[PDB]
Design a binder for this molecule. Structure first.
Ligand SMILES: N[C@@H](CCC(=O)N[C@@H](CS)C(=O)NCC(=O)O)C(=O)O
Ligand SMILES: N[C@@H](CCC(=O)N[C@@H](CS)C(=O)NCC(=O)O)C(=O)O
Lengths: 202, 202
């Protein structure tokens, strides 16, 4: 199996972590999807990472689909419950976390445009999406919808999203008055799979 | 059940069509997610439509998750196969179609920014994503991975994506030398569910 990705993408990281947790052997194929010359299109016409390539040449995308493919392999530890509705509820929370990643990425890409081309309004509305979403996550933990010791596809995705926010310096107050969220991501960050997949920083 | 949406969004339209096809009663709650004052955040902290609200107050997002929720209700006609791997393969194709919508939407939002803030490079790379993706879709139909008479979640999504491209006047050559794709979407557009969900045009 090949995982086509970048070293910074949290969508990719989510999958690297699933595979590492499950002890599944894979080769990483590094790509830079925002350069003009890159090699992503042979794997995904959308030009986005991650992509998973099976040992028959089938290319899987986007990241939630790949995570389900991996789950279907049936290798411990399970990262989704077996019950269809509860699995879908975990995957709704994964979609929330993926949306935090999306908003972080939009923010970073906005700031990569030439100065005169940037929209401060765009930055503000992405930041608001992030804060509202972090509030919903804290609420799940207050309510017991999530627990701080939960390790599943949703919580992996949440910690990847927060790790990305930190890395890119988006929403520096993510931890302010969200103490359950802090505990949850610290618990995940302590795992070897997170330690081995940190984004490179100069 | 409530479907929170806009009248133009193809992500929303995909779900309106599923519900209509299945004869499932719902109320539509219209929202404008790009205005500064809107009502989407009470349903989804990401501030995006669609959202599905159940008759207990649970809010489901994003669109692929909602489509699976609907499928889980087990109401004819089925829009996903029962086998887990083949269902996931249909959902991979749905992800491709959703990515075409994404690229179309990025294009439209780019063109909504003030003139001096626009990136022609951004427009070009979204257009290329679209063309490459349309080529993959045509290839699926040549290979028999899809058929022109296939009616499932993936092909609904494909026709919603193409309908959006047409509506927004993105990728006007989508039909050029993609005759299977043309036939597939014309077959879907002929259905009442598509006729009743067309985007408003002045
Ligand atoms: N919906 C996709 C989003 C993936 C995504 O946005 N990946 C970024 C890197 S973090 C990418 O490849 N961007 C290139 C582009 O948008 O052209 C998923 O969940 O995998
Ligand atoms: N991943 C989402 C994407 C939904 C989406 O992009 N919806 C657009 C309307 S077509 C939206 O609500 N945009 C508001 C925003 O991005 O702030 C899905 O599949 O539902």
């Amino acid at each position: 199996m090949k995982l086509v990705g970048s070293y910074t993408s949290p969508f990719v990281r989510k999958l690297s972590i699933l595979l590492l947790e499950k002890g599944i052997t894979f080769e990483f194929i590094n790509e830079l999807p925002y350069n003009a010359d890159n090699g992503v299109a042979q794997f995904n016409p959308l030009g986005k990472v991650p992509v998973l390539v099976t040992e028959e040449g089938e290319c899987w995308f986007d990241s939630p689909i790949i995570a389900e493919y991996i789950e279907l392999m049936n290798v411990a530890p399970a990262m989704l419950p077996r019950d269809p509705l509860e699995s879908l509820r975990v995957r709704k929370i994964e979609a929330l976390a993926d949306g935090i990643m999306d908003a972080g990425l939009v923010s970073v890409r906005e700031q990569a445009r030439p100065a005169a081309q940037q929209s401060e309004d765009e930055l503000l509305r992405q930041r608001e999406k992030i804060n509202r979403s972090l509030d919903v996550l804290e609420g799940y933990l207050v309510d017991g919808t999530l627990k701080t010791d939960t390790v599943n596809l949703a919580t992996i995705a949440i910690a990847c999203a927060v790790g990305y926010l930190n890395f890119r310096r988006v929403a520096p107050g993510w931890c302010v008055d969200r103490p359950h969220l802090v505990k949850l991501v610290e618990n995940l960050f302590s795992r070897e799979s997170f330690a081995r997949t940190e984004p490179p920083k100069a």
